[model samples]
Target: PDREKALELAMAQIDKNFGKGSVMRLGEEVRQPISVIPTGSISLDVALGIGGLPRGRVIEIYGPESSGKTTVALHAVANAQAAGGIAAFIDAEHALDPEYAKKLGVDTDSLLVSQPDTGEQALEIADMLVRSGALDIIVIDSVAALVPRAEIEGEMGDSHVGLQARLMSQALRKMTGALNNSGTTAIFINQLRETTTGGKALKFYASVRLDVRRIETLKDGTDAVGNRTRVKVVKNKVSPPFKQAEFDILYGQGISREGSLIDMGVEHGFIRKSGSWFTYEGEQLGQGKENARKFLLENTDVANEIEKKIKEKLGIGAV
Candidate 1:
């Protein structure tokens, strides 16, 4: 496909650039290229086709209350801690609880939380964290909770409606460089308002965008049991997008559950299924979701084995 001049240019290759740094061959750059960190959900990662969220990028997760947006971001933060990496959370909403985060497997010691009163301060703090190269993952609890400095100072006149939008633009742009090369992943937990669309700034700069939706509720008799969230990829630059998946989040149990691992073990053939029963390492784990939970809880060793197998299968280590 190369013309005579193009062939000559390629054939007579130069070792390094004169003023610019060494050039990277396209093939070499893309051969063993893509890298990602697990988000702690096999179903969600499998749906994204990347096995995890991208490492050095900005990911937007937006949904209404009870839709699992904050839950997903929390999972990612905990996952980072699980991998022995530092994490930070911009709790602009001031709703994050250390005891709750501890239940989610977050390393409280390694996590830094900042409660910014205004959007400008939030972005400024985030920029410092990202550029410092100290954190592996940073999460913004809710983008909608951020109010522009100007608006907070009562500078917004009747016609100044795009203050937040402009700040969002500046914030994302300011974080773009660090997002690409700081070896850090920043997740912005955005609230889905009645408008149901993120700022154009995000649409233009966010490397990946996911929308969380509430699809089903699990209830037992008169008491509400749990709810399931459907995470769908709307924009992706790392993999083929538009894939969707669902997972259950129990009201009392939070997002982490044993049934998911059992199901995933079977899906990836780590556990054998005999009729309705699931067996791993020749141990009968019983049938149905409840059965799996009960059996595994009683058999902690087996549960640990299943978890190890699932994490290994999902590229959580040595990928």
Candidate 2:
């Protein structure tokens, strides 16, 4: 049983569900493979353990109306493309708009938007995207609106029993193949139903399940400007579960930059600023937000430590 270094790397890659286990000349050079794509929200990312969506997995995000389910998914998609990868949104609910999506930081012109009339049809299209191996992130918007094939072809007035669950089960079983070293992230946005079986079907297979809640609507005294949301983790296979974080998105603006990276940097001990000059590690990094965020995100070891510190701040709890 030699169990050489290559074998260990292969095992590591296997555990991560990515790569072909290519080894580097130890101490020479190597590219640290990305295990997750950042969500563009620091507190949300810190709540998610490694500060992002674990790559090569299906993530289910759901909430009641106006609770920021779509908004969160859009940010992830935006982050994906921002990091120089392609993304697609399968709009079964017919609510996604190029303009609003653009405002949310998503590149609408580069994003592939498809409207499928039925759940089966949407899954089939998702199959194409997954199998084509051309996308970094793909979103299925609001599975609740996806009409089952049976409901469309059968009796029109009667309520279908467990059809969405069945279809979701079937779709996931087939679609999971794309995660095998393909490096694609799938975001499934679902509606929170007021029933016992709410999201029971997809939740079982989801790598991360989030129950989002709107904490408050931000008001400027005269007008409703934006909203704050608490993203509660229901399940996570690779990270701690049941952690919660509050984040806000503003109207006309995207995510609050001050509340996210800049604030998080101070909280986690990575940033200090005097007037406009920013510093990290007691040395001036530059004079802005992007440089600080880029420095933190690029340094995984540092980021991991920061996240641990954040967990201490969060304490132990389930919401």
Worst 10 residues of 1 by lDDT: 18-27
**Which regions of candidate 1 deviate over 4 angstroms?**
1-33, 194-198, 220-223, 265-287, 301-319
The clash count for each model shown is 0, 1
Error of 2 at 206 (Å): 0.5
Residues 93-203, candidate 1: write the lDDT tens digits: 877777767777778877898998788898899999899888888998777777777778877357677668788887888788887778788888877662223356777
* Candidate 1 residue pairs in clash (backbone atoms < 3 Å): none
Q: How far out, in Å, is residue 59 in model 1?
A: 0.5
Model 1 residue 54 distance off true place after TM-score fit, in angstroms:
0.9
Q: List the residue pairs that clash in candidate 2.
A: 45-51
For each candidate, what is the lDDT? Answer: 0.74, 0.71
Q: Write the per-residue lDDT of candidate 2 for residues 1-319, one digit (tens) a residue.
A: 6678777767678756743322223233223333677776667776676558877788888888778888778878888887888998888777776777788778888989898878889988987887877888889887776678888777756675877777777888888767645778888887765222425666877778888888878663556777888889878665656777777677755676544655666756666677766675575545544455456656656545554555467441111
